[PDB]
Amino acid sequence: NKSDAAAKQIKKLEEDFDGRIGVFAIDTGSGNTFGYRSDERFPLCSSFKGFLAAAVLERVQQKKLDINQKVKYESRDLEYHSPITTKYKGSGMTLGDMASAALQYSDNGATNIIMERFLGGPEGMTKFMRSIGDNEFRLDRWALELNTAIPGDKRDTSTPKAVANSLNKLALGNVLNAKVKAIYQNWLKGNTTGDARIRASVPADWVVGDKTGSCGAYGTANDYAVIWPKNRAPLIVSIYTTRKSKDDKHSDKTIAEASRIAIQAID
Amino acid sequence: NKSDAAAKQIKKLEEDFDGRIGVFAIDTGSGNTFGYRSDERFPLCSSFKGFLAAAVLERVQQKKLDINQKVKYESRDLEYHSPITTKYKGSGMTLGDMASAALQYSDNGATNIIMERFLGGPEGMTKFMRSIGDNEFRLDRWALELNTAIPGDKRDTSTPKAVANSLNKLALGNVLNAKVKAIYQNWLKGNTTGDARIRASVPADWVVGDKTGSCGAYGTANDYAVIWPKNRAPLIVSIYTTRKSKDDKHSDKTIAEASRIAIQAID
């Protein structure tokens, strides 16, 4: 009935902003979970960049790539919303800086460079996810063309649950060894775009790492986080939202609130 | 809870001047440590010169260089802020005097000459740091071009903790033998640029050695010190700051104060 309360509250929250909320949350210490529409599909938006950065680190760990190797792109027509890569166009960036920029600022140039040169594009990004046991994740299109968030369209979607499980495996589990996993955590922790989302749902002294996404269409936005509460086992939180109409704006407040409800449901 | 008090105080200090403070402090006699954002990246500015001078002494100890060998530079266009090297342009300087000038007066000419001729430039400076167990330190650019302190930019950064540990290894530990380490200490002790920073945070009869840095952009400044309190085991203090806006000035007062808080936290 703690589950059922949380569910009634997400249902009301989704009715209040006239859309659709998907949640999955894990207490990694007890194994307690809460889910709401946790098996429905939602657009990834930029959020897949968190997994792209893990993919790079996997390669670095296998010695397939070096984290300090220069990635040059002096001639590239940089995609919209490349605030980091724009600054370094002249000198290039380390693969590590570039992958972290893809995560921390949602840099589309970092994203697309890495997928075209190192990861085998959308298909390869999908293969990476299948290789960690994730069967729902599909990336179909490149950084800027995946944000259409069309209702019923399965392209570039996952489920809240798949997102949660995957983050758990990558951030807390055994895909990355001790050294490289720590780097991944530092990267998540240093995310700059999620202050109004899961971060806003927790005490200021809890440590958080997240990646956000915002399609800019159908009010579609999301956020996923590893949370370290004071003196407690990590939590995994995964919140995906969409909305009725093409022109609707996303609601940060709904994401923060659905996170609050989720964190309470596994308390 | 003494840790947590110190942390609340640094957080308020950082909010008051609208920036970001990173701290790491070690009591070498108990092993007690305090840190605040001790794993986040901050620009080195000139501060790496302290490690550059250690690198030189390492080479001297290995018999790769002689501390009294004449370094001539009669034709060089000396970089801005070379007060010592400007004075000796005609005659040259000993490698020892030159390295100490790079430390004590933050002489950019001494800095760049030494990196280009003896240390293998920024990458060699970084290799030196890796070789003492420092995995966070990166030097990417040369003396005058590393002071841009752009938010988000990982070039020429370390963490307060990495800086503290490294200083401990170099100033108090086993990298340099007893004779050469004493030289290094004398050098640190004779620093002339840090009267308003960590030095200002401690009784005037405590003996201090430090290296400062001031990027002159984004209010970015730092200081790191070995402190000998009378009749107590050494302390290591490491304070890094940045600020929100490009035109903000650095705050010596914030550095001195964050040092006071740090030294109390490990008391």
Ligand SMILES: *C(=O)[C@@H]([C@@H]1N=C(C(=O)O)[C@@H](SC2CN(C3=NCCS3)C2)[C@@H]1C)[C@H](C)O
């Ligand atoms: C490096 O940071 C830059 C030079 N190093 C500085 C430093 O060591 O703090 C700055 S600021 C300079 C020292 N100073 C003093 N004020 C109080 C008494 S001495 C002004 C300096 C520019 C170089 C340019 O990279």
Ligand SMILES: *C(=O)[C@@H]([C@@H]1N=C(C(=O)O)[C@H](SC2CN(C3=NCCS3)C2)[C@@H]1C)[C@@H](C)O
């Ligand atoms: C991908 O979703 C998308 C990127 N991703 C974004 C995101 O939320 O991660 C941005 S939305 C923008 C970044 N914002 C903030 N950063 C500082 C405070 S809030 C709002 C952007 C649209 C596509 C278009 O690349």
Ligand SMILES: [Cl-]
């Ligand atoms: Cl999507």
Ligand SMILES: [Cl-]
């Ligand atoms: Cl492409």
